[PDB]
Write an enzyme that holds these catalytic residues in place. Structure first.
Site, PDB file in Angstrom:
ATOM      1  N   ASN A   1     -19.750  -8.138   4.192  1.00 34.30           N
ATOM      2  CA  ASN A   1     -18.859  -9.261   3.910  1.00 34.30           C
ATOM      3  C   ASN A   1     -17.813  -9.312   5.018  1.00 34.30           C
ATOM      4  O   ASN A   1     -16.792  -8.625   4.971  1.00 34.30           O
ATOM      5  CB  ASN A   1     -18.216  -9.123   2.534  1.00 34.30           C
ATOM      6  CG  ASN A   1     -17.338 -10.309   2.181  1.00 34.30           C
ATOM      7  OD1 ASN A   1     -17.411 -11.359   2.817  1.00 34.30           O
ATOM      8  ND2 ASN A   1     -16.503 -10.144   1.162  1.00 34.30           N
TER       9      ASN A   1
ATOM     10  N   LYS B   1     -15.904 -11.677   5.453  1.00 36.05           N
ATOM     11  CA  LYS B   1     -14.796 -12.456   4.912  1.00 36.05           C
ATOM     12  C   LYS B   1     -14.355 -13.522   5.906  1.00 36.05           C
ATOM     13  O   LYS B   1     -15.191 -14.100   6.608  1.00 36.05           O
ATOM     14  CB  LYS B   1     -13.635 -11.539   4.518  1.00 36.05           C
ATOM     15  CG  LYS B   1     -14.018 -10.528   3.446  1.00 36.05           C
ATOM     16  CD  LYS B   1     -12.844  -9.666   3.017  1.00 36.05           C
ATOM     17  CE  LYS B   1     -13.265  -8.664   1.955  1.00 36.05           C
ATOM     18  NZ  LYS B   1     -12.115  -7.865   1.451  1.00 36.05           N
TER      19      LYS B   1
ATOM     20  N   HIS C   1     -16.262 -13.178  -5.806  1.00 39.76           N
ATOM     21  CA  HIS C   1     -15.481 -12.101  -5.215  1.00 39.76           C
ATOM     22  C   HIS C   1     -14.075 -12.082  -5.807  1.00 39.76           C
ATOM     23  O   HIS C   1     -13.504 -13.124  -6.142  1.00 39.76           O
ATOM     24  CB  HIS C   1     -15.420 -12.263  -3.696  1.00 39.76           C
ATOM     25  CG  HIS C   1     -14.917 -11.051  -2.977  1.00 39.76           C
ATOM     26  ND1 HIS C   1     -13.575 -10.759  -2.861  1.00 39.76           N
ATOM     27  CD2 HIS C   1     -15.575 -10.057  -2.335  1.00 39.76           C
ATOM     28  CE1 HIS C   1     -13.429  -9.635  -2.180  1.00 39.76           C
ATOM     29  NE2 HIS C   1     -14.627  -9.191  -1.848  1.00 39.76           N
TER      30      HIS C   1
ATOM     31  N   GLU D   1     -11.259 -11.692  -4.562  1.00 39.63           N
ATOM     32  CA  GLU D   1     -10.299 -12.516  -3.836  1.00 39.63           C
ATOM     33  C   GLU D   1     -10.367 -13.967  -4.294  1.00 39.63           C
ATOM     34  O   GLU D   1      -9.332 -14.625  -4.450  1.00 39.63           O
ATOM     35  CB  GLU D   1     -10.547 -12.403  -2.333  1.00 39.63           C
ATOM     36  CG  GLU D   1     -10.297 -11.008  -1.785  1.00 39.63           C
ATOM     37  CD  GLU D   1     -10.936 -10.783  -0.429  1.00 39.63           C
ATOM     38  OE1 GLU D   1     -11.614 -11.703   0.073  1.00 39.63           O
ATOM     39  OE2 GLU D   1     -10.765  -9.680   0.129  1.00 39.63           O
TER      40      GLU D   1
ATOM     41  N   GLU E   1     -16.900  -3.863  -7.566  1.00 42.63           N
ATOM     42  CA  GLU E   1     -15.845  -3.586  -6.593  1.00 42.63           C
ATOM     43  C   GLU E   1     -14.513  -3.492  -7.318  1.00 42.63           C
ATOM     44  O   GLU E   1     -13.967  -4.533  -7.740  1.00 42.63           O
ATOM     45  CB  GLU E   1     -15.798  -4.662  -5.512  1.00 42.63           C
ATOM     46  CG  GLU E   1     -17.133  -4.919  -4.843  1.00 42.63           C
ATOM     47  CD  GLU E   1     -17.002  -5.746  -3.584  1.00 42.63           C
ATOM     48  OE1 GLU E   1     -16.670  -6.946  -3.688  1.00 42.63           O
ATOM     49  OE2 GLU E   1     -17.227  -5.193  -2.489  1.00 42.63           O
TER      50      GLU E   1
ATOM     51  N   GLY F   1      -9.999  -2.922   0.464  1.00 38.90           N
ATOM     52  CA  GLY F   1      -9.105  -3.063   1.598  1.00 38.90           C
ATOM     53  C   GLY F   1      -7.858  -2.205   1.539  1.00 38.90           C
ATOM     54  O   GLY F   1      -6.950  -2.371   2.358  1.00 38.90           O
TER      55      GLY F   1
ATOM     56  N   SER G   1     -13.455  -0.107   0.436  1.00 42.15           N
ATOM     57  CA  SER G   1     -13.033   0.818   1.487  1.00 42.15           C
ATOM     58  C   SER G   1     -14.132   1.799   1.889  1.00 42.15           C
ATOM     59  O   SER G   1     -13.839   2.886   2.397  1.00 42.15           O
ATOM     60  CB  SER G   1     -11.770   1.585   1.077  1.00 42.15           C
ATOM     61  OG  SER G   1     -10.715   0.699   0.750  1.00 42.15           O
TER      62      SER G   1
END
Ligand code: NA
Ligand code: NA
Lengths: 249, 249
Positions: free
Chosen positions: A10, A12, A94, A96, A166, A172, A212
């Site tokens: 990904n 992003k 996702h 986000e 996730e 991140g 991560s």
């Protein structure tokens, strides 16, 4: 035995035409010796250059989002548009997008169902936040999310569905979940699928971990029984993504 | 007199590789006498194809949306990525994004300011709905929207700014807008800019009409004193967009 592993990249909202080209050169010249489905999710803009540039036989191109239908939705990309463009894989739901862009458990679900009905291979993203973990609510949170997805799907549609657990606290942040933290989460998901959807489906289903991950922790994470691959973000832009692929046996 | 007119085509979330190419081929074979800036705003997916197919020297390409910065924003596209891709124009604040995708007056203003700072020519969209018009807050809503954008811009930045007025009340809702109503909204916008930003800025500011426009009424609409072109939606997917271009005299 585990089903086929998946190493999803990904990118992003990152990358230039040159920096991604150099990253694509590495993937093409990367020798992979085991059966694994590698997935490169770029921006809509970089889909064209990725289609022509990446030619590795074990790699497929994916989008990071879409809306169900075409029409008067300025700024958005639809599933028929992606399908016309030759894109058959897609990342949906996702965290986000769940946080920034108001994608609820039901909006994610209806997007998954529409993509599977369009012939897409879907990587559905679930997971809990840090506040949900320390409150002891990782179980109710995670399964509430997948229950909405499964509700809008038939049993034969799970062959196009891939789950990517996730935890938001690990995305991140550099705070990777321990192999026990990942195994306990993926086993909780797979047993739910076996109870509600079916045992044959739960065996076929691929539960990936994201958050991560890098070349140093990937191997130990994949050794867990219910880990069928990785969804990589920050390390998917770096040469160590090859190591994440090889860590899937 | 009037500044350089603009004919902007907002294809929205529509099109296939074959259909859009034929439309681009028709645009490329069109003789345009007068000075006018034509803009083609496709989905992110089709930006690469539009970049190669479009060759008419009076045509530029634009995005339909973007976020300010690159980073961990799965599914979105940022201004530096578009600028690295060779995209110099962008449409921001479209009514469909204000309604469906949480784009407030402040969020729209922040994207416009970041776009100008990134070297973009920005077509900033404003307008009121039917309920806001039937309740008589046209002047309240419209001026509030442009003020939010203006308070983040310097005087020199308006050279990179284009305002598109969207009569949301007269787009597929049975209400037929008149040229006099379009002129009144355009004159409202320009006079405010003149008193708040300066008369020089208002004299050069292009104010585009973003209603339902066909090649017939586009001539009478452009004859209005404060109409500097069009932001076309549905007719932009059709060869009659050429007639809207020629209607800018
Ligand atoms: Na020119
Ligand atoms: Na100007």
């Amino acid at each position: 035995s585990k089903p086929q592993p998946i190493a999803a990249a990904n990118w992003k909202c990152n990358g230039s035409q040159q920096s991604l080209s150099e990253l694509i050169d590495l993937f093409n010249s990367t020798s992979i010796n085991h059966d694994v489905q590698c997935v490169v999710a770029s921006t809509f803009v970089h889909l064209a250059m990725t289609k022509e540039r990446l030619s590795h036989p074990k790699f497929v191109i994916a989008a990071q989002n879409a809306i169900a239908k075409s029409g008067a939705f300025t700024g958005e990309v639809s599933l028929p548009i992606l399908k016309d463009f030759g894109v058959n894989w897609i990342v949906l739901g996702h965290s986000e997008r769940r946080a920034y862009y108001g994608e609820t458990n039901e909006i994610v679900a209806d997007k998954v169902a529409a993509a599977v009905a369009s012939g897409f291979m879907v990587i559905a993203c679930i997971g809990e936040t840090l506040q949900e973990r320390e409150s002891g609510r990782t179980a109710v949170v995670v399964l509430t999310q997948i229950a909405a997805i499964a509700k809008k799907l038939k049993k034969a549609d799970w062959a196009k569905v891939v789950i990517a657990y996730e935890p938001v606290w690990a995305i991140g942040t550099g705070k990777v979940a321990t192999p026990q933290q990942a195994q306990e989460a993926h086993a909780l998901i797979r047993s739910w699928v076996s109870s509600k959807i079916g045992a044959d489906v739960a065996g076929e289903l691929r539960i990936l971990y994201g958050g991560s991950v890098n070349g140093k922790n990937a191997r130990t994470l994949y050794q867990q029984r219910d880990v069928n691959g990785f969804a990589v973000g920050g390390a998917s832009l770096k040469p160590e993504f090859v190591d994440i692929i090889k860590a899937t046996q």
